[PDB]
Every structure is written in structure tokens, then in C-alpha cells.
Design a protein around this ligand. Structure first.
Ligand SMILES: Nc1ncnc2c1ncn2[C@@H]1O[C@H](COP(=O)(O)OP(=O)(O)OP(=O)(O)O)[C@@H](O)[C@H]1O
Ligand SMILES: Nc1ncnc2c1ncn2[C@@H]1O[C@H](COP(=O)(O)OP(=O)(O)OP(=O)(O)O)[C@@H](O)[C@H]1O
Lengths: 193, 273, 636, 638
């Protein structure tokens, strides 16, 4: 007879050299996933190094916020801007449009500082005021700064100065990333304390 | 001898260069848009520089024309002297604009390459092969003629396979001459093994029979995979090397069954003759 | 001050040691280098002929002959090129890092119609990688025959040839060492010339004694021309090439007699210049995605000389089915001429190749049956590209084809679907399943098919990966019928039904939540079913039951974080079905009834089966089924 | 006769062009070359110290310094090495392929104790990749300093060097091209040193000015800072594995692969002979989430030759299933490329990989002696171990003993195959395993009840990689694996149960044929055997065809050929428990007549339920759901 031949072992190889994984998002303050000092310090450090990477490559983000920051299940933050998903997340230099191109490194550091403020407060900046008509007025004047009375308790106070001197409008004395890595380094050394 | 023109290239979708914490999909966009906007600013500078060049050229042209006109006409000596200084200022502007031009040239020399500037499209032509498909199986026409032609032309190769015993050597030797892999080859192997046992050469029959049995499963598995046996025969000896016990016994039992069938058919042929 | 200007020197013995030992990583490229040099000689002599044909009065034919000889352990490489005189025999083959080819090419700068291979000046000395001593016999038209000879000792002897004269060209004898005797076999040299220099522009001929003479005589030499049988097709202009020549070239390239589905021929010009030829195989390889096959599809050529095969920077992984040859005129090459000194030129070549491949695919779309064959062959590669290339995902998106509700068994693109979609809806309805019939009739499609809406079927596990990045199309979100919160054009009667049903159907749903609290995290009422009473939908964030199944059944999948992305199920009760209504009637009598919850759990398990989920313990379902069939037949 | 001997010559300009252009693919390795030469000078002077310590009066430390000067755009590289005299300056740095390091090696004088990384004589001219003009200032112990200078124009100048004095060693100055200015920044030099020259024995100290000076009681950012963070890692593999404690290994591990915690286990061995290398291998505590993400461009094992980086891990350096092993492999005498980026004789990697595989398997076997650590290792690397079982065809016998599973009496802890063999009854001559999807899924199943009631131990295999592993594993210590999911299961049988089965066939053959007809295409064979106790029907697979779990696993593979599965089906064979009252209740119903709608309905329902309980998936579950729904309707009374 010819029988059946058996053979088998045709392509029973392990073709599984591929990947799949994503946590969800970073917009957890609305989701109300409050975390502790360790997670927020780690996220700030990783987003800092990530954004310094594009700062080195002369790539300016400007519009980076909670909606353009992505968390992942590997305990990593992909600050890679989604592209689509706003107001209240800009700088007065952008609002006045004096040169029609506010796109500068100091503006990106200002945005970084205000998102740090948002995450370390767990609330959207200027929550007391919710009308665009007056919100545009304040940022057009560019005089006042957000208060720091809603800080999350039991964390190193160094990032309080970091966010305070990140949000001042003088771009010439705004801190830059070469000292920002030192700032987050001393933050993570101050984590146990 | 010199590679100084290929030392600055900026590919936007650089897969190898990225950051673990930066979305590679979105990083490939701010690099691309940055390249495009830099090219657009460069082009704008080119175009404005060019209009400036022509406008200062026409400025100095009309200035020399007016200088000549004032020199020709008497009484305009004071106006000619004033136009001397005005002309000198115009030459200063023109020579400054040429300085801007050569600085622009130096900037372009310092400009790193990209996909759009390294090369420009030549010519492309897409051809779609529309050719008749499918095959036919029959015992006559081209198939029988194919049998005769292949057996006449390559008797030595099929005979040497008939006198083979080793699997790996068979794999390599056929890989050199994969043209032997076809249904006609298996058919002639079976028929001439029948003829050999008609000649009553038992040991030679078995040596030929193992080899003939070799491609039968190759053809079966090629039919199973729907791919021509010429493209799947090489792996067969890898499978027989890593063959399970049951596959060994199946190969042995098919070999024995084909041996018995060959012996019976040869006995019938001998009795008929 | 004092200034002492010197000139750089070179230790010739150490230079020879470097070239011989630590210069080329593959000892079999010496044959490629020698063939390249012979091609240069032939190119020079042939170029000189068009100015005056009297040059070729020493033998008209131009060819390269390889004559291995195991009786002397020597491999002879004879060409009929221009040869080289005494001054050339000194300068070219005695001065390391000096090329007569570069001198010849830079001399003309007007007759640039030729492109000869070589600009370094050390390629010949790689011959010592396999031979201890080499003797070179040449005869230029202007000088006499000379016998160049050296053993890489630092000195070479030149003398007038006292042996058999030759008409013209060169005659390189390689006295091979005992360690390289494998280079004298037909198969070895055939493999080397086929891999590296099978596209040289001149006939290459072997010469071996294997011809059997009629019967015990076998002394006839085999004049085997088949080392350069296939000629570079991409060189000739495409308007002069029909499909037949392309087919023959592809058949000879694949070492398998099958045709090609389509052929793309193009080129670019500028600072980077290459004439590329890409082929779409008629069928797919049986080991297309076997990793052991690595990547051996696209070969890079410089002046018809092979450099490197398919690299990940040359062509993306999902486009590894398309096989072709890429040849360029000018590129920066390593000293061994096996890699490029600039990595990103490969990336630029890939950037152009991918765009041309996508344009070829778009051109193939017009042919219906041909594109059907191409899709049935490489839809997996297309969807893998959708997953991988975020930059080209837009161009791959319109190349998709799917079974749909209103197309029977024919596949329609997304463009056809958006063309035929009713204006009342703004979303693309798709179902990720496992089989054709499994999704053809399913609890999630009843309402959609009832209202006339069309849903896209996705029966393959590759689409399950694809759809995570294909989150939109033409400004319309892609939503699945197996996920919670399905949006549907709603009617006033429908919403009245909904609002009265929520109040009417609250008791039984909270009863389900009570009895099933750790397995189901929400029970509600929606518009998804007509002829089925229960279905399990997944939340908007999580894994589809099919998605979860694919993750669970993967060979190499970490389980520590698997539990994180568990789907949070949602029971869906179809109020119009009599089962749930009668169940509510029974529950209203009492909520503690045995049969009520032992039927609720059975309904939940059956719906879980209908929703594609895998049972945690099928034995419980089986044993309750047999107990209930026991009571059905009344055998206790 | 007419022989005329000549001498080989060279084209210096073209040879310079080749050295600058067609050797080094990455422009950054000029730093590696210069640092290697500075370390060479330091090694020379250190060796000379051992014979005469009085020649170190000018400078006592042995340090390497890099001082980028972006304002002038020059990247110096100072070193207190041995320096070069006039003759050495004009010879070594003026002659291509002349390497004074090799000549110094020849003058070892029975004192072979140092490893000298230089053989070619072309390494220095790598500086022209990024620098248009090289200025070299060296000062020997017994010679006045001279200022070597060139621009790769074919002619170089030597100066009396009346400039700033240095005690000893050399000081190369690179006048970088106007575009290769990216190598002055701290990030780039840090990355280059960490990638290539991180393991040089001598301390390399980067110099740069960015310090924010203290201001209290303004805004000063100009102060040169000394950094040695780029050479803190010290090669420990060069020492004997006897004097190194575990905490040293842990510190080196956290400094090597940046992991928060320390290593799990370490292997430190070396082989002497024609091929000599010292291999240091670690095992990470937790496997990274993207360990099997194979688009990661494997870089686990870094091949070092003479303490400098050569090449990342290739396929031939270490097998795919051992990609989790982190460590270094350092050799002494391997042939390098002219670019010093790979090995000329790549076939020697086929020996290095064999030695590493054998020694790491010995490490794994030895590690399987303490329960807690081995359990922690197994939990994270069982997938890799079973992948190795599947792939390797030479270590399969050795690799098999390191496998753990849950069994029928192992409780919640995993036990080896050897332990089960030790608890194996003599009446049985096979190993029983079940391939399902979960622990509880296979704990109670239709294939295990009969065997578990009798005296056999079954092995649970739930991870999807287990099936790939067991297709290759065909025996263990002479005992063959048999799956309980497959047909024709063999058990020790007495004559009483044997005749009971004979009467069972004689009574139920009509059932077998009649529901064979009912399941005309859905089932190939119907038989009865001892596999079931409290379950009436189970379906088993063929002897060589894929089992149910393998079928599901392949149909779930993202990248699979949907032409080979069709003929590689599972030949489903329904098996009946003849003791269950269900299968005899309809026996009389079918005995009365062959054609009954009810008997067909129950047969179909039982077949579907057995298919669900056999691990198979229904082709169309909606039919089963609908018939269940109608049955619930009739039972409830609607
Ligand atoms: N067979 C030959 N016929 C004619 N000229 C030859 C031959 N072999 C060598 N030469 C001469 O020797 C010179 C240098 O030889 P070599 O092969 O090393 O250089 P090349 O051809 O430029 O190659 P490469 O770029 O690979 O170093 C060539 O330029 C050529 O003029
Ligand atoms: N910075 C330096 N300090 C001391 N000697 C040096 C220095 N740079 C070069 N040399 C000398 O130059 C010669 C070798 O130079 P080069 O670096 O080109 O060769 P190599 O290191 O032996 O070769 P390769 O690195 O390519 O294997 C030796 O005599 C060495 O002492």
C-alpha cells in the first residue's frame, strides 16, 4: 500500500518572535489612580530623560501635556505625543504670538514644569477658573502663577522648588535639562527620606 | 578613495536610532516634519536670495545707465558727484548680497543629506505578469514525450541515484541538480526497478528500491503542502534524520510492501514471457 | 624654531601580513577579486577597440577561463584582457594600494561610458589567502610576455616568459596550499562564482576533466560555460524587455522553475544612483516566516558585483516575500567590499524601495483576479506591515480585503465598505473571530444584520494584532460588535423600550450580579441580539475574547502581567427573548430558588461559550449537562 | 635565466586614504583607538617599572585624561604613559603598519605577564576620521619632548616642542573637523567610552566645565569637573573564581546590566590551550518583559578581546534559548579584523558557543540542588529551558532533567521527572502526561480519572511551550512519555478486566457503528477503553496527529501557513465509558430501531459536550447554544 505517510514536522516552528502590550494611558488624575512618591518620582525621571532626548536632537515639542504622555505596563512612560489627543496647556509667549513662533526650548521646559505641577497636585492647573473667556485673559497678561498649596503630602520637598522655579516666566533663568537630570537624581536619592 | 560626501545623512524613519521611552511611531513624525520644514526654510532662503540678486543687479544696471546719462549731459556735474556716492553704496549692497549668496552655498554644503535630496526619481515602469496557469496530468502527449526526453538525456543521474544509499549525500547531490525532482522521475524509477527485479537482481533491486521509495513520500508531502516537490525535497532528509520511531517503521513497511509488489509484478512478467 | 618635514612610510612586510591575514574575513573572496580584475582588463581592452579595431588582432573573443588542476594543486584564471606591460607589471602588482584601473578611468573623463570595478589597489594580494605563491603571465600588445612571480616575501621576480605563449591578456596561476584543496572542486568554484560574480558582464568559463569518452576514456575537458549564463536584465532599458525575459531572469534567480506574479523595474538618479528590480513571487515560500531562513531575498550589487544580501536595514521584515536585485553605480564600500562605510545609505535605499513596492501593490489592485491571488498569498505580510510601519500604515490600509455581510464569499476593501456605508452611521463595524461560520452567525451580529448594517469579518489571528493600530480609517473610528457600549442609530421607540426595560429588568440583573459576583462585573440590557438571550461583551478597554484567546495560546507569552490585561466581562441579556422573561417570572416568586440560579449559571456558561471565551473548568459544564440530561430521561 | 628581482613598494597617499576611509565603519572609534594606545603606553611603563622603579620620577600615577575644548574645538587625550623619543616618533607614528607595541612584545625576555593590545600599526590614523589636523606632544623619560603634527596630507612635521612641559607620556590633540563637533559633548564621549573602553584597567578621567559653583551669604557655570564614572567597572573575571565573593559579583552585575537588585547565580570559568578565554556568566533574577521580543537586536553577551569591546552577541555566540544569560566573554589570542570590530575566523565561535553551552548547562544542573533558588529560577526561565529542549538535539538528554511540573500527588509544588520516576510502579512502563490549558482544567478531566484511581502518577503540563517541548522529548531514563489525550492508552491489564472488555465490545459494537454513522464526518472511530470513570464520553486524538492542545496552539499562531494545517488534522476518535448508565440507556433505544430523532439528539449533544471537555473548540458554537436553549425551553415548560 501507499499508506498515509505521517511525515508531520512541516512548519511546527516557534514563530512567536512578536510582541503585544500597552497599559492604558496617563490621564489617571481624572481616572483618580492616586499613587505614591516612588511612582511619581520614577515617572518624572523617565519623562525627563525622554524629553531631554528630543531636546538634544533639537526637536521641539511645545504642545506636550497629559494627553500627549503615554504610560505602559512595563512601568515606562512613552512621552511620544499621540498627535491629536488643547487649551490651558500653553504659555503666554504662545498666546501673545509676538513672533508667531513661540516654539523654543524654554517653552518646552515650562510645559514640562506645569505638567509636573498637574501630576504632583493630582488636579488640572487653574481648576477654580473654567471659562475660556477669562482664562485667555490671564495667560495673555502672563503675570500670575499657580499656587503650590495643593501639594501631595509626604514627598521630598526638592521637587517643590523644582516646579516653583520651572513655572516662573523668566525664560533666561528657567532651569535646563543638564541640571534637570541632577535634580531628578537627587530626587531619587531623597526617595527613602 | 574618498567618502567625504556620504558622511552626513538624515533618515527620518531610522529604526535603529530611537529611545526606549519615546514612541517610535510618533518619533518618526517629528523627524520627518522637521526635515520638511528645514527644507522649506532653505528653499525660501534660496528664492528670496535669488530675487535679491536680480533686483540689486537691475539697481546697479540702471545706476550705471544714469551715471552715463549724467556724464553725457552738461551741468549735472554735482548730480554726477552725488551719484558717485550713491553708486558706491549700490556696489556695497551688491557685493554684500553676493557674500550672502556664498554663505548660503557654504550652508548648503554643510546641509546633511536626506531621502529627497540624495536622489531624484528616474523612471519607473510596473509590469504585471498575466500568463496562463494550471497544469495537466496524462499518460500521453507532452507528458509521455517529457518522460522519454528526460530518461534519454539524464539516464546517468537517475541511475547513480538508483545506486545510492546515503541520505545526506542524496540531498546534496540532488540540490546540485534539482531538475531530477519530478513525477516522471518517480515513475521511471518504479518501472525500471520492476525491470531490475525482472532481471532477478535482489540486492540491486533493494538498493534501487530504497532510493525509489525515497521520493514517493516527497511527492506525497509536496501534494500535501501544495508546493512543487522541487521546493520541499531538501527538508525531507532533515525530517527523516529527526524522524520518530513510527515514521521509521512506516518507511520500512512501505519499503517492504513496495518490494513485495515489485517481486510479484516481476514474477507475473516472467510467467507471461 | 625648527621644522622637520618628513613623508609617511610603510613597512611593506607588515603591510603584506595585514593584507594576507587580518584584512578579509572570508577566504573565498579571492576568486571574486580575481574575476573583478579580469573583468576590468576585458573592459579596458574592449574600450580601446572602438577607437581602433586593430587593437584586437591578438584574439577577438573576450572571456575569462578558470582552469583548476588537482594534479598540480594549482588553479589557473586566464582572461583575454588588455594585459599589462613591464612598467604596469611593476607599478600595479608591486605597489600596494595603487590601482591601474583608477588611473585608467581618471585619465579619460570623456569616455565615461564604462564603469570598471576597483578603486583601492590591494584586491590582487588577497590571492595569497589561499595560495603561497602566485605566478602571473601577461602579454600586452606593446610589450612581450612576462612571468611575474612572488610568494609574498617582499620581493617579486619578473622575467621574459620562456614557455607557451598567449595571444593577449593575463594568466594567473595560484599554487594553492594544502589547506585550500577544497577550492579545486567543480561545486565549490561554481558556488563561489554564482554567489559573488555571476552577474559579471563577460562570459566566465570553467575547464574540468569529467567528460566520459566512448567507453573507458574520460580525458575530455568539460567546456562548461554555465558560470555567467544569466545576464544582468535590469541594465537593459525596460521598454526593450518583455515579460518573457523578466520571467526567465526570475526563474534563474530563484533556482526553481516557477513564474513570477509581477515585476517592478525602476531606478533613481542623483548623488545616489541605483537601478533596482523587484519581483513578487507567484506563490509564497513554505518557510517564509521560518526564522532559520533569516533574510536572503534582496541582494545589493555594486557595478554588477554582489556586496551584501537581505539586511534588516535594506528591506523591512514584513516585505521579505518580495525578492529582487538592487544594483548601484557608486557606493562607499569597505576594504573587503562586503559592507558599506555609511550605514544609513541602506536605510535610504530601503526608504525608496518600500515606496516603490507600495506603488507596485497599488498598481496590482486594478487587476481583480491577480490581486486576489496576491492577497491570498501575502495578506499576512500586508497586515504585519500595517502593524509595523506606522509611517506607511496609511498606504497599506487601502490594500486590505475582507469578507463582509453583503459580499458573500468575495473580499471587499475598506474603500468599498465606506462607499456603501449608510450615512446614518459614522463607525466601521468589525468582528474579530476564529472561523468563517463562527462569525457568520453569532450573537453579536443579529441586530446589525437585522437593521441592514454591514460588518467586516476578521477570521484570522493576524487581524487581531492589526486592528490595535488600525484605530481609524478616513476619519471614522473602527468599533467592534463584541465590545461594551456598541453605538447604534437609535429610534424613539427603541429608547422608550430601553428606558422601560431598565426599570423592568433591574431585579433579575442585580440577581445575576449577586449570584455571579466574581465572574461577571456587570449585567445590563442593550440592543445586540434578536434570537439569542445572553451574550458576553468585553469592556471598551481590555482584550476581546478572541484577543484574550490569542494571548493565552501564544507559545512565548509572559504570565506575570497576563493577569493585568484580563478582560472585564459584561453579561448582556436580551429582554425580548422568552428565556429571560420566564426566568424573571420565576425569580419574582422567590430569589432563593435552587433551579433559578442553577439555570442562571448554565445560561452564563453557555453564553460564555457563544462569546468565544474559554471555560475555566469545562468539567463543571459537562457534569451539569449530564446531570440535567439524567433528570431529562428520568434515570436519577 | 633572465630572472630580475624587484621589491614591493606602496602608494603612501592612497594607503592613507584607505586607512582613513575604508576600514572603520563608525567615526566614533577613533576614541577607542586612542584610548587603547594610551593604555598600551601605560602598560609599557608599568612593566618597565617592575624592573626599574627609578624611571617614574616624572609622574607617579597612571591616568588617562580627555579634555574637550569646544571654544577651540579640540579634543585632547593626555596620558602619563611611556612616551616616545625622536626615533620612535618618526618611526611608529610615521610608518604605516609599523607598530612599536608589537616590537615591545617581541622584547618580552621570558617575562610574559602583560597583555598588549596592538598588532597592526594603523590604529593611530583613525583620528583623521573626525580630526583634520592631529597634533601629538610626547615626552620620553630619556629624551626631550617633541611636537608631532600632521594633517594626513602625506607629510608630517616634528617640532622641538618649546611649549608647555609634561612629566611623562604623550598628549595627542585632535583638531576636529568643522562638522564632527558632536564628539565634544559629555553625552557622546560618555557613551563611546562606556561602549568600547569601559573595561580598561587604567582610570580614564573625563574633563568638562559645567559645575554650578556654590553661592551663599553668582550664576557661575565654568569649572572643570573630573569624572571617573566611566571606568568604575573593573574586570573581575581576570581573577580566580576562588577569591571573589558574591557581593563583588552582585556589584559588577548591577554596574553591568543596570538591574536594581543583584544576580541570582554566577558562572566563572576559563579554558586554556590554543583557544583561551575567561567567561563570566550571570542569571538575572527576573526575566525582562521583552526578553522574547526578538526584534530587540540581541546584545546579551559582549565579546571582549584584551579588555576592549569587539562585537555584540551574534546567533553563533550563544543559542537563542540562552539569550537571558548576561555576562562577558574575554579572550587573549583571537584573530581580529583590520577594523577590530569582529573575528576573522568566525568558525571559532562554533567552539566558544559549545563551551559556553556546556558550562552553563553544568551551572544549571548544579544550581538544581537548593530548592528555593532553583524554584525562583524555574518560575522565570522555564520557557527558555523548554525552548532549549525543543531546539537543541545534542543536549536534550542533559537538558531534560532540569524540568519541573505539577503532578497528581505533587500538591502545589513542582517536582522533576526523576522524582516521579523514583515513585514509579514497576507494573507501569510509561510516563503519563496531560497537555491542557490550566492547572484546574487538567486536574479533573475525562482522561485522568481512571488512571488516577489506579496506581499511576500523571504529569500536568499547562504552559503552551510544554507541547513544543514534549514533541521533541520522546523518552526519559528509558521510559517513554505517553499522553492521556491520545488514543490507544496502555495500562497493566489483568485477565478479568480483559474478558470484561471483550464482552463490552461484544455488547457495544452496535453502538460504535451506529454513532459512527451518526458522526459520519465529525468522528473517525468510536471505541471503548479504560480512560473514564464518572464521565460517559471523551474524544482522543490520533497517534501522530496534533492533539487538541497542539491544534489550538497552532490555530492561534499569528504567522502560520493555512495550507499545512488542513492535512495535519486531529483524527478525533470518540471513546465511551461503558459503565456510565447514559450510554446504555439509549443502547436499548437504538436496539429497538436504528432511526430515532431523540437518540440522534442525545448522541449529538454528548459528542459536543465531549468535544468541549476534550479541549477542542467547536466549529460553530451557535448550533450547540441553540440546541441547549431549546432543551432548556422544553425542560422549563415553555
Ligand atoms: N588580470 C589583470 N589584468 C590587467 N590588469 C590587472 C590585472 N590584475 C591586476 N591588474 C592591475 O593591477 C592594479 C591593482 O590591482 P588590484 O586588483 O589590487 O586593484 P583593483 O583592480 O583596483 O582592485 P581593488 O579595488 O579590489 O583593490 C589594477 O588597477 C590593474 O591595473
Ligand atoms: N598615545 C600614545 N602613547 C604612546 N605610544 C603611542 C601612542 N599612540 C601611538 N603610539 C605608538 O604608536 C605605535 C603604534 O601605533 P598605532 O596605534 O597606529 O598601532 P597599534 O596600536 O599597534 O595598532 P592597532 O591599534 O591598529 O592594532 C606604537 O609604537 C605605540 O607605542
Amino acid at each position: 500500500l501507499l499508506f498515509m505517510g505521517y511525515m508531520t514536522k512541516d512548519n511546527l516552528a516557534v514563530i512567536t518572535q512578536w510582541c503585544e502590550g500597552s497599559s492604558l494611558y496617563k490621564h489617571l488624575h481624572v481616572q483618580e489612580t492616586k499613587f505614591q512618591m516612588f511612582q511619581l518620582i520614577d515617572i518624572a525621571r523617565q519623562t525627563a530623560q525622554g524629553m531631554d532626548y528630543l531636546h538634544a536632537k533639537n526637536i521641539i515639542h511645545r504642545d506636550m501635556k497629559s494627553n500627549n504622555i503615554f504610560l505602559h505596563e512595563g512601568l515606562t512612560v512613552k512621552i511620544g505625543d499621540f498627535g491629536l489627543a488643547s487649551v490651558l496647556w500653553m504659555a503666554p509667549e504662545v498666546i501673545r504670538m509676538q513672533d508667531n513662533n513661540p516654539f523654543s526650548f524654554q517653552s518646552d521646559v515650562y510645559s514640562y514644569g506645569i505638567v509636573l505641577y498637574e501630576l504632583m497636585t493630582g488636579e488640572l492647573p487653574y481648576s477654580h477658573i473654567n471659562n475660556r473667556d477669562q482664562i485667555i485673559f490671564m495667560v495673555g497678561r502672563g503675570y500670575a502663577s499657580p499656587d503650590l498649596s495643593k501639594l501631595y503630602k509626604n514627598c521630598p520637598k526638592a521637587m517643590k522648588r523644582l516646579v516653583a522655579d520651572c513655572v516662573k516666566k523668566v525664560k533666561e533663568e528657567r532651569p535646563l535639562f543638564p541640571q534637570i537630570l541632577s535634580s531628578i537624581e537627587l530626587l531619587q536619592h531623597s526617595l527613602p527620606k | 578613495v574618498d567618502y567625504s560626501v556620504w558622511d552626513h545623512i538624515e533618515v527620518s524613519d531610522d529604526e535603529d536610532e530611537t529611545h526606549p521611552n519615546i514612541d517610535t511611531a510618533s518619533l518618526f513624525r517629528w523627524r520627518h516634519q522637521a526635515r520638511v520644514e528645514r527644507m522649506e526654510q532653505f528653499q525660501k532662503e534660496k528664492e528670496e536670495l535669488d530675487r535679491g540678486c536680480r533686483e540689486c543687479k537691475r539697481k546697479v544696471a540702471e545706476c550705471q545707465r544714469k551715471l552715463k546719462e549724467l556724464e553725457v549731459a552738461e551741468g549735472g556735474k554735482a548730480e554726477l558727484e552725488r551719484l558717485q556716492a550713491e553708486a558706491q553704496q549700490l556696489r556695497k549692497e551688491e557685493r554684500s548680497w553676493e557674500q550672502k549668496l556664498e554663505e548660503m552655498r557654504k550652508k548648503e554644503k554643510s546641509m546633511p543629506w536626506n531621502v529627497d535630496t540624495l536622489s531624484k526619481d528616474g523612471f519607473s515602469k510596473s509590469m504585471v505578469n498575466t500568463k496562463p496557469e494550471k497544469t495537466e496530468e496524462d499518460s500521453e502527449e507532452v507528458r509521455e514525450q517529457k518522460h522519454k526526453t528526460f530518461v534519454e538525456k539524464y539516464e546517468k543521474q537517475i541511475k547513480h541515484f538508483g545506486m545510492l544509499r546515503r541520505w545526506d549525500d542524496s540531498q546534496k547531490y540532488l540540490s546540485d541538480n534539482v531538475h531530477l525532482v519530478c513525477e516522471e522521475t518517480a515513475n521511471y524509477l518504479v518501472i525500471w526497478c520492476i525491470d531490475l527485479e525482472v532481471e532477478e537482481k535482489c540486492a540491486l533491486m533493494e538498493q534501487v528500491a530504497h532510493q525509489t521509495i525515497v521520493m514517493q513520500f516527497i511527492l506525497e508531502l509536496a501534494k500535501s503542502l501544495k508546493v512543487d516537490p522541487r521546493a520541499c525535497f531538501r527538508q525531507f532528509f532533515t525530517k527523516i534524520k529527526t524522524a520518530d520511531r513510527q515514521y521509521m517503521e512506516g518507511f520500512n513497511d512501505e519499503l517492504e510492501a513496495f518490494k513485495e509488489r515489485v517481486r510479484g509484478r516481476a514474477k507475473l512478467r516472467i510467467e507471461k514471457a | 624654531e625648527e621644522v622637520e618635514t618628513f613623508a609617511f612610510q610603510a613597512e611593506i612586510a607588515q603591510l603584506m601580513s595585514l593584507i594576507i591575514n587580518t584584512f578579509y574575513s572570508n577566504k573565498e573572496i579571492f576568486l571574486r577579486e580575481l574575476i573583478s580584475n579580469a573583468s576590468d582588463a576585458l573592459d579596458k581592452i574592449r574600450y580601446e577597440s572602438l577607437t581602433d579595431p586593430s587593437k584586437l588582432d591578438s584574439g577577438k573573443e573576450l572571456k575569462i577561463d578558470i582552469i583548476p588542476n588537482p594534479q598540480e594543486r594549482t588553479l589557473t584564471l586566464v582572461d583575454t584582457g588588455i594585459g599589462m606591460t613591464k612598467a604596469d607589471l611593476i607599478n600595479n602588482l608591486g605597489t600596494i594600494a595603487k590601482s591601474g584601473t583608477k588611473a585608467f578611468m581618471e585619465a579619460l573623463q570623456a569616455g565615461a561610458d564604462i564603469s570598471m570595478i576597483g578603486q583601492f589597489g590591494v584586491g590582487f594580494y588577497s590571492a595569497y589567502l589561499v595560495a603561497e605563491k602566485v605566478v602571473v603571465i601577461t602579454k600586452h600588445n606593446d610589450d612581450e610576455q612576462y612571468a611575474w612571480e612572488s610568494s609574498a616575501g617582499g620581493s617579486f621576480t619578473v622575467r621574459a616568459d620562456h614557455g607557451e605563449p598567449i595571444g593577449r591578456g593575463t594568466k594567473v596561476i595560484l599554487h594553492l596550499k594544502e589547506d585550500q584543496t577544497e577550492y579545486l572542486e567543480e561545486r565549490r568554484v561554481k558556488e563561489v562564482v554564482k554567489k559573488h560574480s555571476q552577474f559579471i558582464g563577460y562570459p566566465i568559463t570553467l575547464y574540468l576533466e569529467k567528460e566520459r569518452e566512448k567507453k573507458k576514456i574520460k580525458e575530455k575537458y568539460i567546456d562548461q560555460e554555465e558560470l555567467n549564463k544569466t545576464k544582468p536584465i535590469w541594465t537593459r532599458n525596460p521598454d526593450d524587455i518583455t515579460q518573457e525575459e523578466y520571467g526567465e531572469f526570475y526563474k534563474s534567480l530563484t533556482n526553481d522553475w516557477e513564474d513570477h506574479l509581477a515585476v517592478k523595474h525602476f531606478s533613481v538618479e542623483g548623488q545616489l544612483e541605483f537601478r533596482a528590480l523587484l519581483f513578487i513571487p507567484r506563490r509564497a515560500p513554505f518557510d517564509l516566516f521560518e526564522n532559520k531562513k533569516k533574510k536572503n531575498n534582496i541582494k545589493l550589487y555594486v557595478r554588477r558585483v554582489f556586496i551584501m544580501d537581505s539586511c534588516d536595514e535594506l528591506i523591512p521584515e514584513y516585505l521579505n516575500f518580495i525578492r529582487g536585485v538592487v544594483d548601484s553605480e557608486d557606493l562607499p564600500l569597505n576594504i573587503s567590499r562586503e559592507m558599506l562605510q555609511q550605514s544609513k545609505i541602506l536605510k535610504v535605499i530601503r526608504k525608496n524601495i518600500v515606496k516603490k513596492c507600495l506603488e507596485l501593490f497599488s498598481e496590482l489592485a486594478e487587476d481583480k483576479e491577480n490581486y486576489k491571488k496576491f492577497y491570498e498569498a501575502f495578506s499576512k505580510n500586508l497586515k504585519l506591515g500595517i502593524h509595523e510601519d506606522s509611517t506607511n500604515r496609511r498606504r497599506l490600509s487601502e490594500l486590505l480585503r475582507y469578507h463582509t455581510s453583503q459580499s458573500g464569499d468575495e473580499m471587499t476593501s475598506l474603500s468599498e465598505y465606506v462607499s456603501r456605508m449608510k450615512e446614518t452611521q459614522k463607525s466601521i463595524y468589525y468582528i474579530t473571530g476564529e472561523s468563517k461560520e463562527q462569525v457568520a452567525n453569532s450573537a453579536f451580529v443579529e441586530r446589525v444584520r437585522k437593521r441592514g448594517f454591514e460588518v467586516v469579518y476578521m477570521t484570522e489571528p493576524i487581524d487581531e494584532y492589526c486592528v490595535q493600530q488600525l484605530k481609524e480609517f478616513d476619519g471614522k473610528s473602527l468599533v467592534s460588535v463584541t465590545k461594551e457600549g456598541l453605538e447604534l442609530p437609535e429610534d424613539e421607540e427603541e429608547k422608550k423600550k430601553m428606558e422601560e426595560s431598565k426599570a423592568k429588568f433591574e431585579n433579575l440583573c442585580k440577581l445575576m450580579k449577586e449570584i455571579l459576583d466574581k465572574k461577571v462585573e456587570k449585567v445590563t440590557i442593550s440592543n445586540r441580539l434578536v434570537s439569542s438571550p445572553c451574550c458576553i461583551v468585553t469592556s471598551t478597554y481590555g482584550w476581546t475574547a478572541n484577543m484574550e484567546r490569542i494571548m493565552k495560546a501564544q507559545a512565548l507569552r509572559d504570565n506575570s502581567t497576563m493577569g493585568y490585561m484580563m478582560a472585564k466581562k459584561h453579561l448582556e441579556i436580551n429582554p425580548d427573548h422568552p428565556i429571560v422573561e420566564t426566568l424573571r417570572q420565576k425569580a419574582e416568586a422567590d430569589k432563593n430558588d435552587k433551579a433559578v440560579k442553577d439555570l442562571v449559571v448554565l445560561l452564563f456558561e453557555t453564553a460564555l461559550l457563544s462569546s468565544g471565551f474559554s471555560l475555566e473548568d469545562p468539567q463543571t459544564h459537562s457534569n451539569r449537562i449530564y446531570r440535567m440530561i439524567k433528570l431529562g430521561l428520568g434515570i436519577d
